[PDB]
Symmetry: D6
Subunit: 166 residues, 12 copies
């Protein structure tokens, strides 16, 4: 039972990396070029876009992907320099669990579960409140849901292994 | 008879991957830049494009290509870790068959058999119904038909092998 | 006499692949951005471009290049799995001949021998007949002629070898 | 205690290089295309952009990354040519410390701790003072803070090792 | 004396290839985007550009570079298949000489020795004669002269070796 | 004393190549797109840009980098073919010195020590004298100074080694 | 009682003429210049304006004013030529009554009682139905009501006098 | 019976003059400013407008009005100079009849009975045939019909008087 | 004392008429051409202008001027037809008083005492609330105050005369 | 016979004045606003219009009309001051004849008999020769012919009277 | 001496009225259409024009002309009604003097002695201070000076007559 | 001889007034709308037009016409009030002579004898010197010459009469 867990964890990790690397960068290419607001004021588009999307999804996902694989690099470097291993194993497993749970919660609190098509903006220099229109909301919603599902699976597997070792 | 089946399956898979990888990404490059609607309303182009093409063909095809090759990766990882194999063989064959049939049916229900040149749009903020015009419909229709034919061939071969093993 | 034939065939094939790969993709880059028609109607440019150039030359050439090298891949895979070979040799030679002749005839019937500088278009929504102007006709004509010559040489060599074996 | 220091230093260095290389170049892509000032004067945008951002952040970071790894290259070349090593070791450690502290102080004095959204410009040919608007200030602020934190960690580790050797 | 000739020939060939490959493709990038004519007629820019520059310099140079190295590929393939060699050596030397002289003469007759800054155009649909303006004439003139000098050196060396063998 | 000279020369050469290769090509990307002159005359921008910047800095630097490493290639090819070496060593050292001094003097006479922000242009078809505005002058000035310093260091080291051998 | 009727009739007639002559012509001056429809189709504005306002109010009112005073001119010309008068008097009174009632009914059936601010148009070449926006609807509504009231008063007075004579 | 004929003729003449003078000049004010054709060719609007409307209606009507009152001026001048009168009376009546019939027939042959909303134009420099759109067709049709009716009434009355005198 | 009252009343009336007639019509000429709102929505300018200024000041003043002089016309017509006069005198004085007081109160309730420079508009099709900018507010405020003062003087004089007669 | 000559001369003169005064000024209103040339050069329209039409037809006709009636004014002033008359009569008749013949010949030599629709212009700052397009050529041709006919009639009558007096 | 004073006063008054009436209204026609400010802000032109020119010169001059002739109208009406005259004469002379002096002082305090070509504006919604440019400053300065001189002459003459009567 | 002088003077004066009044005002209508300069600077057109044409010709001519007829008005007013006359006659003749000579000299010194088609302008805010283009130079030159000739004739006649009286 615990034999297949490692295989499934590795396959899920590789799948997530490949999906993020091959396709993600071209959905978000024209995010700001195709953002439009109903106004004649110079500088309102910049402020309203910056308020609507403080950090892009793809930047967050790349950062998370790189950060969640650091314990393995530390373990490999330690083993290479050596050339209490179980203590290092346990510590790295715990750290991986904590990092993954933290990142999942942060994603939920940053983005939610959908991308709406309209936005209401009231930042200077825009006069009172204006309405702005988003590009490709449906595809971005699908991406959000898919990423959340994959991260949940990863968390479940890590908890399973942690409870297996005891 | 069953000897040539594996060779033909491998050749078809490689051919599909190469065709999708080398040429597909540049037909769909200007999909939204060359989309135009007859109107003066800001934000109508975004809504009508999003309603006409919820998910691009190329995204769907890349996802399908990556997803239909996961059982082989699982088998290879299992064999590497080992260094009832027939049980794994049978299970992976069954899973491949199911995944391919599901993806083919999903493609048919998502896209149909052609891409029309005109589109009729009635989404907010567009007033009543408007007419929009598509880029490169004929080439996209040819691509659709070619992909459907290749996927059908793959399904036929997988069913043949499944019935061969028994 | 038959010794040099194989060398010349290989050199011609490699030359064709290199020529298509290095230079072809940048002549056709701006095909639709620099296409213009004399009109004020929205959507007329899309329809007239789609009617004038249903499939781009470069797409056809890439498809042909990939398709005409499949018998070699099948032969290599068969030999690798084995690790009546002459029957496979004869069959693959025949198939290569048929594929090359078919593709040459298809090219002739699709494109002809030149690219004109003006086009007359009468497709909806354009009112009556309009005149449109093409980008880089002379270079494209040169490319067409060069490709036809190379394909003819390849056909001649394949027929020579087929008659040599008997 | 001193065993883990080298591992952590190497991991931090690799992390910084990867973060700068993979994501940084695409945040700053449209820095000058999306810079706008409220005026009708030709040439005012160029002058005001040049005054606001004399050197881009990414150029400075690439230069610093390349410059802080030169002592290692010198050491490797010396060892290769040889094929008082401790004297070279001490000297290169000292030089690395000095370079890192200098670069950190220079960053602080060049950029500060945030990127504001508005800029006030009074350079010829602009008449009196004008107001200009910046692109993506929040993301750039986050990047600044992250880079400062990483560089501080590196400085702390280098000082720790220097005091360890004595 | 004949020892250094081969070394100088190889170095010159590699230098020419590197110069053409690294820098040439970006001087000619905006050739047609920055071409302008003084007129209000739609379609006049296309016709006048096509008449002024039938084939780009870079296309011609790439074709020549690829074509002048085919005898070496034939010789290598012959030697590999073998695993009267002097007859092949002599024949390939003669063919190289002929190809290089032909290409040099063709370049001279196609392009001349300079690129002027103004062009006078009288092609339909332009009314009578119009004046058009070229991009980056000085750099292109420098490139032309440099390429001519290199090709002349190559021709001289090939003739030297041909006379050396006798 | 003469041991470290070779190491420092190699490190400086590699540093210069890396700096030119990684960052230089993107500072000069928009040189002509963001060049503007105060006028209504068609064709004046082309003439004034061509007069202000006959050859780009990056082209000159790439050419110099490639040209100053040819003696090493000649030496390596000679050694490979051999498989009076000191005569070749001395000759190549002398040639390297001459080439580097010539290129440094040429740079000084071509470009000077700074890039001004305004330019005064009086070339046909511009009427009398006009004023034009440059993009990113400060960064280009910094680049100029840095390159001059590096080249001076290289010249000093080469002269040192030449005097060392005697 | 019948003495004041003639005075009131004359005063009302003069008042109507003055009101129409002095102010009416400048409310309707920009009727078609400030008419706008939401579309990109050439020729749609003309068709939709022509369908919304077949005849301008001011043209109708001028025609009516001129036509309702013809019997007086006929009577004056008859009297001048003479230089059964009661028969002419009765006949002209009857004709005036009939003309005024006919014109009032025609106005009601042509225009109604208000001018709306939006219009829905479905005439060729407009595609399907479009929305258009009117200029100065409130003032035109006030004018309509005022004119109707005045005409009603005139009709009442004419009927009163007709019944008075018997 | 013949007494009322003169009165009715005078009243009709005055009515026609007043109608033409007060209202006609402002319907045709924007005839060429609001004329539009679907094309990008300079000079096509001028040619197509000139071909569609060689002479404006209002010019023709003013000319006719002035020309049909010349016999009265001649008669008055003759009487003033005198200060066979019946011969002059008869001659002027005949001339008036002839002029009025000629002008009515000319109007019918020049303009017809309606103004269409679309026009098809094939004059140089327009390429092939184009479609153009007219301003205020309905009002102009009403004007045409009204003028024809009035002129017919005038002709009938003149013939009546001519037959009365005998 | 009562002798000068009539003279002052006549002079004030003539002064008001002259002031309104000579200068008023050219202050309000460009009221709608120079009205601007900050928005990209078609049709918002029309709605917001119509809501801000339902009836122009000049139209109201012309109507009032014409309406307040009708009793004099009635009196003159009565006297002419006659060719209890005191009863008519008293009645016309009373009617003039009532009309003037009513018009003054109506002006106060319609317009107030100033014209502001900014307007806030929330009418369909404008999205939420927008800001619009007025032309020549100061001059229009001066006009308003001047007209109010003149009308007040007229009312005072009419009341004085009414109380004088008793 | 000579009695009717004076009447016909007066009627013709009055007719010419009325025709020129009422209609002529509005055909030529938009002469320069609707003049267009195919070019991008600033200032070419002004030069080409000034070269095509040095003096407008209407200016010439007004000048001629005023100048040909001066002898009558001189005669009237002489008679008024008096309050050899035949000598003045003869002299004024001769002067009128001379002035009319001179003006007719000048018209013929200035304008010819038609107005063409296209014009070829080669004046600075236009580059080489350009093509320009005229407004309302047919109506202007009709006007030219009509004016020539009227002037010819006037000349004939004046010569008739001159020969009558003897 | 006092005889010529009245004649000169009348001539000066008539001259001033004629000069103001015939030419003044067309210098100020395009005051706001040709007013321009260097900015991209909507609504800044309106505010800055309103602040620079609160009341137009021509409005002030028309008001003054009408107001300074009221005493004569009062005197004429008094004389007509009469059909102590010296008391009225003296009173009207005094009132004329006071009105003229007041208007001259008001002109000086409102406008000064020149119209500058540049204006500096700092009113909302303009950001900080902007620069605006005036139309026809020199002609307006000449007009100002001429009007001041004429008014001064009038004041001098009125004072002369007042002192003459005593 | 002196009898005809008065008649010719009156006729010339009336002719000049009529010519200036009927035609002059419409040649200069579009003087500033059709003035263009080759530049991108806001405010340069205003400054350059104001420098080229400080006072319009028509304003100067109207002022001169009004000013040269004041002595006659003074004489008429004196005669009317009277109802040494020769002293007034002589004085007014002298004053007329002086005024006419002064105005002619002023015209010559202000305008010269022709209007050129190009203008060179160097006023702030224009950068250095720019070129501007004038509207209708030939017609304005003709007008200048005609006016000068008429004024010269008037001066000659006035001097003749002055010498006649003695």
């Amino acid at each position: 039972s615990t034999m297949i867990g490692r295989i499934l964890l590795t396959v899920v990790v590789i799948f997530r990396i490949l999906i993020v690397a091959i396709v993600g960068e071209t959905v978000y290419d024209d995010e700001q070029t195709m953002f439009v607001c109903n106004t004649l004021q110079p500088g309102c588009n910049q402020a309203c876009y910056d308020r609507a999307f403080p950090i892009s999804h793809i930047r967050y996902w790349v950062f998370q992907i790189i950060m969640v694989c650091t314990p393995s690099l530390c373990f490999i470097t330690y083993s290479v320099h050596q050339s209490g291993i179980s203590r290092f194993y346990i510590i790295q497993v715990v750290f991986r669990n904590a990092l993954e749970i933290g990142f999942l919660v942060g994603q939920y609190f940053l983005y939610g579960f959908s991308v709406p098509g309209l936005y209401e903006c009231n930042r200077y220099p825009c006069i009172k409140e204006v309405e702005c229109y988003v590009s490709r909301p449906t595809e971005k919603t699908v991406f959000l849901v898919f990423m959340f599902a994959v991260s949940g699976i990863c968390v479940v597997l890590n908890l399973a292994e942690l409870n297996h070792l005891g």
